[PDB]
Amino acid sequence: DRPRFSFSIAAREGKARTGTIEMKRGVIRTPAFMPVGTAATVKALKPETVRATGADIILGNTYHLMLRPGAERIAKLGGLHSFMGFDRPILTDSGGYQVMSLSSLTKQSEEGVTFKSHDGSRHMLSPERSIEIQHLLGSDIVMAFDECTPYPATPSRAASSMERSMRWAKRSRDAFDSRKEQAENAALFGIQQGSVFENLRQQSADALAEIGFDGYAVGGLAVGEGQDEMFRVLDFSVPMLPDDKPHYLMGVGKPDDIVGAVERGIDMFDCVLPTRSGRNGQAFTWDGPINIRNARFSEDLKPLDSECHCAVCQKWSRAYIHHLIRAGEILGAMLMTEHNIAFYQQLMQKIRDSISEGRFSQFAQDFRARYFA
Amino acid sequence: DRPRFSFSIAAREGKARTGTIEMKRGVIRTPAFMPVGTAATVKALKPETVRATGADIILGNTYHLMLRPGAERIAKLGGLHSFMGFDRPILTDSGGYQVMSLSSLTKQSEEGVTFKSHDGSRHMLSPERSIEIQHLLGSDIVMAFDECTPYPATPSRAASSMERSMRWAKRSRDAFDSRKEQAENAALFGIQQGSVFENLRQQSADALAEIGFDGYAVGGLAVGEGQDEMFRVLDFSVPMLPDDKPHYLMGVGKPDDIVGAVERGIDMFDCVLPTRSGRNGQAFTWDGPINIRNARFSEDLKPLDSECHCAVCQKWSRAYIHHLIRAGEILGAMLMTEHNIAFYQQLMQKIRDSISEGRFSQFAQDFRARYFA
Ligand SMILES: [Zn+2]
Ligand SMILES: [Zn+2]
Numbered sequence: 187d188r189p190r191f192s193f194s195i196a197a198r199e200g201k202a203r204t205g206t207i208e209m210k211r212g213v214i215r216t217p218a219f220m221p222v223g224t225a226a227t228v229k230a231l232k233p234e235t236v237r238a239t240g241a242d243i244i245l246g247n248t249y250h251l252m253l254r255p256g257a258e259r260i261a262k263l264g265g266l267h268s269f270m271g272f273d274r275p276i277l278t279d280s281g282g283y284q285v286m287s288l289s290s291l292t293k294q295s296e297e298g299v300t301f302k303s304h305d306g307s308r309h310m311l312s313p314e315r316s317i318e319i320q321h322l323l324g325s326d327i328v329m330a331f332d333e334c335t336p337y338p339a340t341p342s343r344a345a346s347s348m349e350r351s352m353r354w355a356k357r358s359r360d361a362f363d364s365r366k367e368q369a370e371n372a373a374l375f376g377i378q379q380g381s382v383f384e385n386l387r388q389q390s391a392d393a394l395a396e397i398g399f400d401g402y403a404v405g406g407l408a409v410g411e412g413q414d415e416m417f418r419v420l421d422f423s424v425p426m427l428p429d430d431k432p433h434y435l436m437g438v439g440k441p442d443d444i445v446g447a448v449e450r451g452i453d454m455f456d457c458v459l460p461t462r463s464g465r466n467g468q469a470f471t472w473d474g475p476i477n478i479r480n481a482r483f484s485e486d487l488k489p490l491d492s493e494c495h496c497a498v499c500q501k502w503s504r505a506y507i508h509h510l511i512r513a514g515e516i517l518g519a520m521l522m523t524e525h526n527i528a529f530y531q532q533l534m535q536k537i538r539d540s541i542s543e544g545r546f547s548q549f550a551q552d553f554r555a556r557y558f559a
Numbered sequence: 560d561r562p563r564f565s566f567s568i569a570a571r572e573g574k575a576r577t578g579t580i581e582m583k584r585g586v587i588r589t590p591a592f593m594p595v596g597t598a599a600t601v602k603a604l605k606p607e608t609v610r611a612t613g614a615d616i617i618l619g620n621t622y623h624l625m626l627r628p629g630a631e632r633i634a635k636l637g638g639l640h641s642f643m644g645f646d647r648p649i650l651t652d653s654g655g656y657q658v659m660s661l662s663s664l665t666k667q668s669e670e671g672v673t674f675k676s677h678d679g680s681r682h683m684l685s686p687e688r689s690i691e692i693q694h695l696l697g698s699d700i701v702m703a704f705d706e707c708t709p710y711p712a713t714p715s716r717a718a719s720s721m722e723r724s725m726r727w728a729k730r731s732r733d734a735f736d737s738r739k740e741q742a743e744n745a746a747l748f749g750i751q752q753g754s755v756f757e758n759l760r761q762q763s764a765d766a767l768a769e770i771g772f773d774g775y776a777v778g779g780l781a782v783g784e785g786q787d788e789m790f791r792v793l794d795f796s797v798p799m800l801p802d803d804k805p806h807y808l809m810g811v812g813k814p815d816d817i818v819g820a821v822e823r824g825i826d827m828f829d830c831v832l833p834t835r836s837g838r839n840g841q842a843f844t845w846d847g848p849i850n851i852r853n854a855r856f857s858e859d860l861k862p863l864d865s866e867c868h869c870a871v872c873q874k875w876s877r878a879y880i881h882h883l884i885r886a887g888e889i890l891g892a893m894l895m896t897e898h899n900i901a902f903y904q905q906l907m908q909k910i911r912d913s914i915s916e917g918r919f920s921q922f923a924q925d926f927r928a929r930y931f932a
Pocket of ligand 2: 864867869871872873
């Protein structure tokens with residue numbers, strides 16, 4: 187039977203790594219892409235379809251679920267896995283980021299954040315309550331509760347925010363450890379902050395390693411800084427994290443961002459881009475993204491992508507999906523989403539295979555040359 | 560290899576019949592329920608899911624398709640079956656009814672109807688053009704072009720409308736027969752009109768039988784007259800149609816309407832009720848319909864229906880689907896629609912089996928006693 191948590195690195199090329207995370211509910215192949223389930227559903231897909239695309243794990247957003255249907259209610263009903271019918275690992279975010287972006291009348295303090303539901307109902311969120319909600323949902327990978335520092339940030343503000351987040355990381359660790367069922371069956375990840383400043387990124391990494399976590403996220407990136415700056419920060423930030431644990435880049439991203447982040451030592455990713463932009467007509471292909479609503483696709487009998495192995499590309503044309511999206515049909519969202527998530531999983535598979543074979547550098551070059559042709 | 564069209568009655572009980580229609584693209588078990596595909600999709604379902612529920616045939620709405628993506632375009636792309644990925648029989652309506660209900664600035668004449676797209680683009684629709692559009696789509700069962708007489712109608716207006724529709728039925732027959740590929744591979748149904756008036760229903764049946772069709776629809780019902788009146792008209796109208804051909808009640812209906820119509824000799828049905836009302840939260844059960852959005856379902860772990868064999872009822876709870884529909888999630892529409900269409904197909908299967916076993920009267924009584932408890 188599988189352990190609570192074991193990360194094993196099978197092959198390396200430069201800073202890139204490929205391997206597996208074993209957990210009670212399944213094995214996660216890394217580098218991994220996690221489709222996002224916003225309110226207990228990966229939008230427009232049955233869980234069996236999510237699995238069929240190759241996903242090993244999904245991300246569940248806590249903020250939405252704590253408001254609707256409610257964490258206690260989900261626990262009463264048997265937990266998130268049973269509720270939504272997805273039996274493999276689920277990583278839950280802490281809820282803190284969406285509180286700031288989506289809710290109103292927020293009040294921050296050292297204790298946590300109070301906020302009004304985007305309902306007007308009132309609520310608190312502290313490290314302790316976030317860890318508890320993630321427990322009630324039955325999360326397999328629990329994220330420590332922290333603050334995503336705005337970009338740009340002054341050094342003083344980035345430091346203050348990072349320091350509070352490290353105090354909150356210790357509180358998150360202690361809350362998780364004080365719940366026996368959670369500590370024995372789930373994993374806890376800590377989040378590095380520090381904005382774009384190397385000294386703050388180092389202090390944050392040191393604090394997180396002293397507390398000790400099962401994995402380490404690079405937080406606070408993909409917040410408007412652009413790819414060059416994101417990569418510059420990853421260049422010095424990822425080596426600060428423990429080498430023997432997974433490295434998770436939150437909220438990234440576009441295919442080229444993923445490739446470059448893997449080149450810099452990242453093992454895990456999530457983003458709404460394939461699902462959200464799929465519903466809005468953007469399809470990913472090896473030759474770059476296309477907008478299926480464009481009139482040039484109205485009589486195009488080719489599949490979305492000429493090499494993609496997904497069920498959508500085996501069965502339906504660009505012309506049909508163009509019609510569906512233009513007509514506002516639900517099946518359009520279903521088909522675009524399945525294809526995009528399958529594309530992302532095929533990208534991750536090519537990344538894993540190329541690292542395993544010692545030809546990832548060449549893959550990255552070939553991928554870019556074609557994707558940006 | 561199957562014939563163009565063969566209807567065979569295997570068993571009878573009173574006026575009810577069960578049997579099969581053989582066509583080139585498949586066998587249709589009767590009495591049959593046809594899910595509605597409005598714009599080349601049964602809303603929120605892949606074609607494989609439509610088939611998995613038990614459907615043998617779907618209805619395609621012509622009016623929407625002739626506007627978007629266009630009949631000529633669909634023909635260029637290989638026809639409706641290839642376009643949408645559904646390889647079994649498709650019955651197409653004539654387009655006339657939605658022209659009147661949905662379009663603007665309509666002008667009627669003996670030639671046909673001119674109308675403005677609900678776009679503002681202009682278009683004509685005559686018997687000849689309707690049959691041509693249905694050919695371009697690649698329809699297996701083509702409906703003659705007629706007028707659905709408003710309810711209530713005076714005897715004079717009902718007669719004038721019926722008489723024009725019979726002239727249009729002959730034009731539809733001749734247009735269909737003058738296209739060799741269509742005449743050899745598809746079937747043509749004529750539509751009885753006459754409002755609620757027995758003498759006009761008889762004149763209409765006589766005219767249609769003299770022209771000769773592969774099947775006969777009862778048109779002009781389910782237009783606001785109520786079930787008692789609908790059944791009263793069916794009582795005298797269905798026996799006027801040729802016994803040895805299928806009888807199609809257009810735009811019906813609720814489960815009890817279907818049962819009573821089968822008791823009166825109807826073999827085929829279509830309606831948007833299971834799909835449309837599913838997206839709006841109404842689920843059909845053997846104990847009557849429920850509205851899944853009701854708060855009483857928020858913690859109900861039972862499936863939508865306790866006996867239903869569909870995949871939704873095997874995997875997900877009322878509580879989860881309640882959450883999805885309240886949240887506006889696409890998966891809610893998908894699951895409600897799959898269940899409702901599966902329920903309708905299970906109803907049709909129980910009807911067919913009970914007629915085949917000579918216990919349909921008892922089934923109808925048992926069905927009503929429980930559905931309306
Ligand atoms: Zn594909
Ligand atoms: Zn069901």
